[PDB]
Scaffold this motif. Sequence first.
Motif, PDB file in Angstrom:
ATOM      1  N   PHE A 193      16.979  12.441 -51.136  1.00  0.00           N
ATOM      2  CA  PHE A 193      17.200  13.277 -52.309  1.00  0.00           C
ATOM      3  C   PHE A 193      18.308  14.307 -52.126  1.00  0.00           C
ATOM      4  O   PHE A 193      18.300  15.348 -52.790  1.00  0.00           O
ATOM      5  N   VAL A 208      33.195  18.225 -62.258  1.00  0.00           N
ATOM      6  CA  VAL A 208      32.057  17.312 -62.180  1.00  0.00           C
ATOM      7  C   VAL A 208      32.464  16.032 -62.910  1.00  0.00           C
ATOM      8  O   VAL A 208      32.474  15.972 -64.141  1.00  0.00           O
ATOM      9  N   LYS A 209      32.843  15.008 -62.146  1.00  0.00           N
ATOM     10  CA  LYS A 209      33.352  13.770 -62.727  1.00  0.00           C
ATOM     11  C   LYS A 209      32.277  12.720 -62.990  1.00  0.00           C
ATOM     12  O   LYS A 209      32.352  12.017 -64.004  1.00  0.00           O
ATOM     13  N   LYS A 210      31.273  12.583 -62.114  1.00  0.00           N
ATOM     14  CA  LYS A 210      30.278  11.539 -62.330  1.00  0.00           C
ATOM     15  C   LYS A 210      28.945  12.126 -62.791  1.00  0.00           C
ATOM     16  O   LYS A 210      28.563  13.225 -62.381  1.00  0.00           O
ATOM     17  N   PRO A 211      28.221  11.417 -63.662  1.00  0.00           N
ATOM     18  CA  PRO A 211      26.964  11.954 -64.202  1.00  0.00           C
ATOM     19  C   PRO A 211      25.782  11.929 -63.246  1.00  0.00           C
ATOM     20  O   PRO A 211      24.734  12.494 -63.588  1.00  0.00           O
ATOM     21  N   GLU A 212      25.891  11.296 -62.080  1.00  0.00           N
ATOM     22  CA  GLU A 212      24.735  11.185 -61.202  1.00  0.00           C
ATOM     23  C   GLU A 212      24.242  12.562 -60.771  1.00  0.00           C
ATOM     24  O   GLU A 212      25.006  13.528 -60.698  1.00  0.00           O
ATOM     25  N   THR A 213      22.943  12.643 -60.489  1.00  0.00           N
ATOM     26  CA  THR A 213      22.296  13.868 -60.039  1.00  0.00           C
ATOM     27  C   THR A 213      21.945  13.856 -58.558  1.00  0.00           C
ATOM     28  O   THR A 213      22.315  14.778 -57.827  1.00  0.00           O
ATOM     29  N   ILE A 214      21.232  12.827 -58.094  1.00  0.00           N
ATOM     30  CA  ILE A 214      20.689  12.783 -56.740  1.00  0.00           C
ATOM     31  C   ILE A 214      20.574  11.324 -56.312  1.00  0.00           C
ATOM     32  O   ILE A 214      20.543  10.413 -57.141  1.00  0.00           O
ATOM     33  N   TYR A 222      18.204   9.550 -55.083  1.00  0.00           N
ATOM     34  CA  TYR A 222      16.925   8.863 -55.305  1.00  0.00           C
ATOM     35  C   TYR A 222      16.252   8.275 -54.065  1.00  0.00           C
ATOM     36  O   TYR A 222      15.033   8.074 -54.075  1.00  0.00           O
ATOM     37  N   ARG A 225      24.130  26.579 -37.522  1.00  0.00           N
ATOM     38  CA  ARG A 225      24.069  27.953 -37.054  1.00  0.00           C
ATOM     39  C   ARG A 225      24.588  28.917 -38.114  1.00  0.00           C
ATOM     40  O   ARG A 225      25.505  28.606 -38.879  1.00  0.00           O
ATOM     41  N   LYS A 234      26.227  31.465 -37.325  1.00  0.00           N
ATOM     42  CA  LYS A 234      27.536  31.916 -36.868  1.00  0.00           C
ATOM     43  C   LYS A 234      28.656  31.362 -37.737  1.00  0.00           C
ATOM     44  O   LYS A 234      29.707  31.997 -37.880  1.00  0.00           O
ATOM     45  N   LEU A 249      26.414  15.963 -61.272  1.00  0.00           N
ATOM     46  CA  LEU A 249      25.968  17.170 -61.956  1.00  0.00           C
ATOM     47  C   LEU A 249      25.337  18.149 -60.978  1.00  0.00           C
ATOM     48  O   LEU A 249      25.345  19.362 -61.215  1.00  0.00           O
ATOM     49  N   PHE A 250      24.786  17.640 -59.881  1.00  0.00           N
ATOM     50  CA  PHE A 250      24.285  18.449 -58.778  1.00  0.00           C
ATOM     51  C   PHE A 250      25.185  18.137 -57.593  1.00  0.00           C
ATOM     52  O   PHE A 250      25.148  17.022 -57.060  1.00  0.00           O
TER      53      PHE A 250
END
Lengths: 88, 50, 357, 50, 150
Positions: free
Chosen positions: A36, A25-31, A33, A64, A66, A43-44
Motif C-alpha cells: 500500500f 499529478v499526471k496519473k489518477p492512481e492512488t496506491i 493495492y 535516520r 540526521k 493522486l497520492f
Amino acid sequence: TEEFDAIKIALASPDMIRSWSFGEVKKPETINYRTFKPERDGLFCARIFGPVKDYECLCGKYKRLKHRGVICEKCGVEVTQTKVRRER
Amino acid sequence: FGIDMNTDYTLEEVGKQFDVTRERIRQIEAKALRKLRHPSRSEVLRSFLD
Amino acid sequence: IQVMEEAPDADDLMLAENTADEDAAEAAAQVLSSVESEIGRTTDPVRMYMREMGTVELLTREGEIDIAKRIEDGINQVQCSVAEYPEAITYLLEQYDRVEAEEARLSDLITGFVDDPELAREKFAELRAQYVVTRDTIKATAQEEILKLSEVFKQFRLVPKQFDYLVNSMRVMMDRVRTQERLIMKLCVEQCKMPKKNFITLFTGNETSDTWFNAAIAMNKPWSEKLHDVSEEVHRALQKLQQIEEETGLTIEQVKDINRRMSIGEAKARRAKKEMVEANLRLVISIAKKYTNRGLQFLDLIQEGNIGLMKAVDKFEYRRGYKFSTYATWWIRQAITRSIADQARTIRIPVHMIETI
Amino acid sequence: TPEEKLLRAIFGEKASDVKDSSLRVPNGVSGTVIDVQVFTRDGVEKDKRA
Amino acid sequence: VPLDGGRFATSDLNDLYRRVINRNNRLKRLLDLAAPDIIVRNEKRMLQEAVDALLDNGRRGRAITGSNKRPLKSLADMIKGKQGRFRQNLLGKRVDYSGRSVITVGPYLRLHQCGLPKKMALELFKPFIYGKLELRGLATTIKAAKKMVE
DNA sequence: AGGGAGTTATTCCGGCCTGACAAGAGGA
DNA sequence: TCCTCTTGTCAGGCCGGAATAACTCCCTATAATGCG
Ligand SMILES: [Zn+2]
C-alpha cells in the motif's frame, strides 16, 4: 508563528497556482493495492506531497533523522516530518 | 550516540576527533557504561525504566 | 418561495429569507429571455451529443467500400511521393545494412513485400546497383533512371514505424527548407523594404539563384545598398538552401510538387476516415449500452468506443470481402472492456486479476 | 531516539517486537465473568481452551 | 485511511480528482491522434463537466458516485454547511477537560460552591495531580506518578 | 472473450566485505 | 597492585541470479448501427 492581521482575498492567477504547487499529478492512481505504498506520480504521491512516515523515505534508503533535507535519489521524496503532507 | 548533537560518529571518526583512534576509545565507552551500572547513579534511570 | 408539498401556511418568517435573497435581479432578465425564445435548454451533454451524431446519416455498404478505396489511394499516393528524392533511399539502405550486417533485426524493417529474406536481399542488391549507376549517370537521362528506380522501389512495404519515421525525416528536412526560405524572405521584405509585387516577379520561381539578388542590388534602391549590411546573413541562408537542394538535387519546383501532393493525399485519407468514424458512431454507442453499470459514466464509455472505432477504421481491410461493422465491433468491445477494467476501481487492479475475480 | 538507545545499552533492555492489544475491562466496571465463547475459523489450530 | 479488516474509506474528492485527471489525459491522447472535431469537442464538454462538478457539484446534472446513490460532496459543499462553517460554527468543536453528569440538590452547599464527584475530579485534574506529585518528589518521574494514580 | 510471449521490477537465497567485541598481558 | 594496550574472529550490510507479478503488441472477420 507570525502575528498577522488583514486577510486578503483575490483571484488566483495561474502563475500563483503554479507557485504554491510542488509537483504535477499526471496519473489518477492512488496506491499500489498490493504493497500500500503510494504510486508515483498519482493522486497520492510522496515525492510531491510528502513522506508517508516520519523522517524515512519511501524506498527505505534513509531512515535516520540526521537526514532531513536530502532527497533520495531513487525516490524523489525528501526526508522530513510526515505532517508536511497536510499542507503541500 | 546523538545526545545533544546531530549524526552519531562511529569509533574511528570519534578517535580522529580526539586524534586517538584505537581500542582505547571503545574501552573508555565500556568502562563508563560499567561504572554507571552501579546504583545511585542508575537508581534515577532504574526507576525511569518502563 | 420554496413552498412545501401542497402549499401550507403559518409561520411569519418568509420575509427574512425574502430579504436574504438580493436586489440584483438579472435572473428576472435571464428567465424572461430564455423562456421567451424556446431554444431547447439541453444542458445534459447526452442530448447534445445525441443530436450531433444524429446529423450524420448511415454511410451504406458501397459508400464504405468507396471511402476505403479513397483511403488506400491516399496512402499509395503519399508512398509514391516519398519515392521521389535521392535522400530517402540512403537511410533505407542504411537501416537495411543495419539489419543485414546484424546491427539490427530482420523483423524491424519489413513485414512482407508485395509481388522471403533471400528475395529481399537480392532486390536490395539490385537496388544498390541501380541507385549507384543512376547517381553516377546524374549528368534528362538521370531523371528517367531515377523514375525507373522509384518504379522498382514501389515494391517495398516498410513497417508502420519506419513509414512514420521516413515521412518525419522528410518533414523535418522540408521544415528546414521552408523555415530558411521564410526567414530569408522575411528579412528581405521587412529589413530591405522589398516591394512585394517585384518580390513576386523576380524572387518567385527559383528562390535559389542569385539572379533576383543581383537584380535587386542593381535596382539602385537605397535599401538595396543597405542590402550588404546583412548580405552575409541573407546570402548565407540562400547558399544553405542551395546546399539543401544539392542533396535534394532535382530542382525547387518538385519540392513544391511533393509537399502539395503529400498534403493532398493525407487530407483525402483523413477525410475518408472522418466519414467512416461519423458513420459508425451510432454503432459505437449501440455497443456501449452493455457496460454502462460498471461504475463508469456513459459518455466515457462512448468515447473509449470512439477511440476503438478510430483504430478499427485505420486497420480495416475491405478486400477480405467482409462487412466493416462486424470487424469494428471487435475493437470497440476490446477498447471498452480495457478502459472499464482500468479506470474503474479506486485502487486500480491489473486486468488479469480483474478477469480472475 | 538516541537517548533511548543509550538506556537500552545501559540496562540491557532487549526490545520486544510485539505491541500490546489485550482486551482489558472498561473503566469502572466490576463483575463476574459468567460465560466465554470462542470462534475459530476453519484451518487454524485451535488452542487448549477452545 | 485503512479501516480495519481490509476495507477502505475515502473522501469523494479522490473520486472527483480521478475523473478530472482521466478525462484530461484522454483529451491529451485524442489531441495527439488528430481525431475529428466532434470527438475533441465532446471531450472538452466532458472536461468542463468534471471541473464544474468538482468546484461546485449541484448546478448541473448532479454527478452521483459509482453505484452509491447519494450525491458526492464537492469542495463547495465541504465549505458551506449549516450554518456555513460546520466545525467552525455551530456545532461546535469538542473540547478537552470536560465532563458531564446528572445534577442533584444538595441543600447543605453554600451559595458559591458545588458538589463535584471525586472520580470526575481525578480524571479532569490528572495533569495538575502529576505536577504536584512530582513537585513534592513523592514520585521519581511522570510514569511513576501515573502508576500511583492508577 | 479472456490467452499470451516477451520484458523489467522487485523480493530473495548464496556469497563477499568491514566494524566490533572478547580475553590476556604488560606498564605505571 | 591496579590500570592499560594487543592480536584475531564473528556478525551484519551489500550485490548477482532467479522467480513471481505486471504492461504492450498479436490480439479477431457473418452481422450487429440512435436512447440514458
Ligand atoms: Zn528512498
